[PDB]
Amino acid sequence: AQYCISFADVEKAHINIRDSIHLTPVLTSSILNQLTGRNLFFKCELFQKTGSFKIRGALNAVRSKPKAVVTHSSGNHGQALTYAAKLEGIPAYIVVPQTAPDCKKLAIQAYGASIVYCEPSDESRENVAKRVTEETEGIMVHPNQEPAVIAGQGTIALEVLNQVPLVDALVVPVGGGGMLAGIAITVKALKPSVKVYAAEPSNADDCYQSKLKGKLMPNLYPPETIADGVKSSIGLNTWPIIRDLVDDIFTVTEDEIKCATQLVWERMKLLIEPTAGVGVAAVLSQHFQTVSPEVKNICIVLSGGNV
Amino acid sequence: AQYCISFADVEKAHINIRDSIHLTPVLTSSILNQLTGRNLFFKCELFQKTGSFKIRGALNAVRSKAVVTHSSGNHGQALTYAAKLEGIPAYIVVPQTAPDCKKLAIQAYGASIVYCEPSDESRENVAKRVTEETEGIMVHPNQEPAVIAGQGTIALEVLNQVPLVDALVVPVGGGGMLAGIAITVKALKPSVKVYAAEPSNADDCYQSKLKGKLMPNLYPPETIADGVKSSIGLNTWPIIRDLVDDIFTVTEDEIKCATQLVWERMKLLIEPTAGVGVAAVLSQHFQTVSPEVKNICIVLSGGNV
Numbered sequence: 001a002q003y004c005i006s007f008a009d010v011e012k013a014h015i016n017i018r019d020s021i022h023l024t025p026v027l028t029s030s031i032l033n034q035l036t037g038r039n040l041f042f043k044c045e046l047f048q049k050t051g052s053f054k055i056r057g058a059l060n061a062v063r064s065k066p067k068a069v070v071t072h073s074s075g076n077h078g079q080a081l082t083y084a085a086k087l088e089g090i091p092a093y094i095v096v097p098q099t100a101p102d103c104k105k106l107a108i109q110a111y112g113a114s115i116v117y118c119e120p121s122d123e124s125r126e127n128v129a130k131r132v133t134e135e136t137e138g139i140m141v142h143p144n145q146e147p148a149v150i151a152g153q154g155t156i157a158l159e160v161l162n163q164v165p166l167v168d169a170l171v172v173p174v175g176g177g178g179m180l181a182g183i184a185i186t187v188k189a190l191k192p193s194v195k196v197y198a199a200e201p202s203n204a205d206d207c208y209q210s211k212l213k214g215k216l217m218p219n220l221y222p223p224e225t226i227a228d229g230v231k232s233s234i235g236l237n238t239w240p241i242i243r244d245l246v247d248d249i250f251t252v253t254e255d256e257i258k259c260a261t262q263l264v265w266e267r268m269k270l271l272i273e274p275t276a277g278v279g280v281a282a283v284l285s286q287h288f289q290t291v292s293p294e295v296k297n298i299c300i301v302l303s304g305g306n307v
Numbered sequence: 308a309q310y311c312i313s314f315a316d317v318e319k320a321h322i323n324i325r326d327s328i329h330l331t332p333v334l335t336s337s338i339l340n341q342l343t344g345r346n347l348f349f350k351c352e353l354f355q356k357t358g359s360f361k362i363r364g365a366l367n368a369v370r371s372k373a374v375v376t377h378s379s380g381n382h383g384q385a386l387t388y389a390a391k392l393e394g395i396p397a398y399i400v401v402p403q404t405a406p407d408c409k410k411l412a413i414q415a416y417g418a419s420i421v422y423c424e425p426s427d428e429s430r431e432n433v434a435k436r437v438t439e440e441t442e443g444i445m446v447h448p449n450q451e452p453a454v455i456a457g458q459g460t461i462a463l464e465v466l467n468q469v470p471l472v473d474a475l476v477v478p479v480g481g482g483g484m485l486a487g488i489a490i491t492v493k494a495l496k497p498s499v500k501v502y503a504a505e506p507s508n509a510d511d512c513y514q515s516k517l518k519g520k521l522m523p524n525l526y527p528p529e530t531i532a533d534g535v536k537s538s539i540g541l542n543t544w545p546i547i548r549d550l551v552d553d554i555f556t557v558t559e560d561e562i563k564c565a566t567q568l569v570w571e572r573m574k575l576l577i578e579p580t581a582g583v584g585v586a587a588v589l590s591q592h593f594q595t596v597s598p599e600v601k602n603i604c605i606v607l608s609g610g611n612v
């Protein structure tokens with residue numbers, strides 16, 4: 001009934017961010033249509049500013065006053081949050097373990113971040129981030145559980161429902177479930193007859209196990225997967241939305257993820273990152289054949305291109 | 308302009324908890340009137356179920372599965388009683404290195420104990436693990452809005468029991484009690500002053516209000532007032548910042564002398580943390596409070612000693 005956002009938050013996020021992000025195109029592939037027996041549509045967030053959808057949630061958090069923003073998610077969220085900060089005239093501090101390789105340190109510096117070091121543990125990441133937040137009088141922006149962020153990711157669905165007016169399902173890769181939850185909130189509020197499907201690595205299948213057992217079941221161990229963007233577990237804010245509003249979750253093997261990513265590179269000529277191959281792998285997977293033949297028009301979110 | 312609770316939440320908490328708490332009496336002391344030059348009224352939460360006001364917030368949180376906390380003193384004791392009223396287990400997270408006497412005391416008030424290591428880190432994560440495994444909820448001792456709303460009900464009773472009250476004086480630790488009370492008084496009768504009382508040895512609240520920003524204690528405070536070692540937090544600070552009129556600090560010696568004064572001259576078995584409000588009104592700087600602030604109600608917040 002009442003989740004950490006409603007669709008009103010998504011609409012507000014849309015107005016909030018639309019002048020500063022790309023309304024990314026929806027593309028097709030007859031080769032992938034033939035392989036799946038479906039009518040596929042590819043929402044190209046790999047074309048989004050900062051190279052992934054995450055600028056949606058990050059910009060909405062910064063515009064929704066703080067003197068600085070902080071995160072220890074140093075990948076696509078960190079990159080997105082730093083750009084959002086730049087747009088708003090404030091520094092972004094990224095908390096990074098001191099033991100991170102130079103190449104990662106340099107890449108984080110290169111996207112505009114001010115780096116603060118921690119020790120390589122979840123414990124240290126959070127407390128150093130808290131200290132930086134409290135010293136800079138800024139705010140921490142979580143990559144997937146922050147309601148302002150979830151609301152921002154949900155705007156993807158607003159665009160898809162307009163761009164593919166006869167869409168039957170969306171397929172969404174799931175890590176922390178920020179994108180999945182924002183989309184589920186939006187689709188089910190506007191057109192609940194459209195299916196919302198998550199796509200998840202078998203090697204990181206906390207979301208799949210959670211919906212099966214009916215309770216939040218985070219990955220016990222740090223996941224090993226080439227889909228680097230979906231290693232996070234779902235959390236306290238995204239799980240209830242995913243529990244009630246997401247229709248199914250499809251897991252894919254490491255090999256499925258690799259083959260799908262290569263298929264997209266080679267036959268679609270789109271430079272997606274492997275995390276973005278996860279949704280494509282799902283629609284190609286054996287179990288997706290159990291999806292009713294009436295679910296013909298399927299939009300897959302190609303969520304990033306930072307590779 | 309909009310905090311983590313409103314007056315409406317306080318009133319709902321009062322209705323929610325009234326059948327299971329005591330409307331504690333307000334007492335007086337001509338000796339302490341004489342020493343202060345004020346007309347004092349003592350709200351006796353030392354007489355409250357579980358021995359402190361904390362049952363107000365604890366019960367409201369449980370009525371608003373299992374409950375979990377790593378605050379093992381008056382809050383854990385209150386939370387365990389609330390849990391038992393509601394037919395659910397209460398899990399108190401305690402460091403392994405805690406003294407046997409303290410482990411036995413926590414067991415004796417009805418808790419199921421789970422061990423952690425003696426760090427804030429370990430306390431929180433073990434508490435979190437117990438919470439997920441029992442499908443329960445963690446109830447924070449001072450930052451949980453349902454708890455804050457519960458403590459606020461003290462002010463409802465005081466305003467009713469002392470119609471001509473000019474000020475309330477409240478010990479502050481995490482500021483749950485202070486913030487709840489400030490929300491209530493300033494909603495109902497903002498002409499009444501809300502004063503906090505704090506140990507000089509744990510003066511984060513005082514320093515915060517001075518600097519205009521949340522300034523937690525840098526180190527674990529050393530003070531005989533065990534119940535107010537916690538710093539104020541993200542939910543209670545904004546209320547305290549905007550709705551509390553003044554914070555008075557007191558020395559360790561002032562706290563000790565006030566506590567013995569209450570024992571010897573009032574014959575009330577307060578715990579030393581409850582002596583802090585009394586020390587505040589006796590302190591030198593309280594003499595700067597306008598003479599028109601005559602009727603002062605001090606909360607004697609606990610008797611678990």
Ligand SMILES: *Cc1c(COP(=O)(O)O)cnc(C)c1O
Nearest residue numbers: 076175176177178179229303304
């Ligand atoms: C973050 C990320 C995801 C997963 O998003 P969540 O909201 O964490 O589920 C998917 N694809 C890419 C490219 C990402 O960076």
Ligand SMILES: *Cc1c(COP(=O)(O)O)cnc(C)c1O
Nearest residue numbers: 381480481482483484534608609
């Ligand atoms: C907890 C406690 C306090 C302080 O209450 P807070 O809400 O943490 O400020 C004061 N007196 C006693 C006896 C207490 O147990």
Ligand SMILES: [Mg+2]
Nearest residue numbers: 204205206207
């Ligand atoms: Mg997962």
Ligand SMILES: [Mg+2]
Nearest residue numbers: 509510511512
């Ligand atoms: Mg203090």
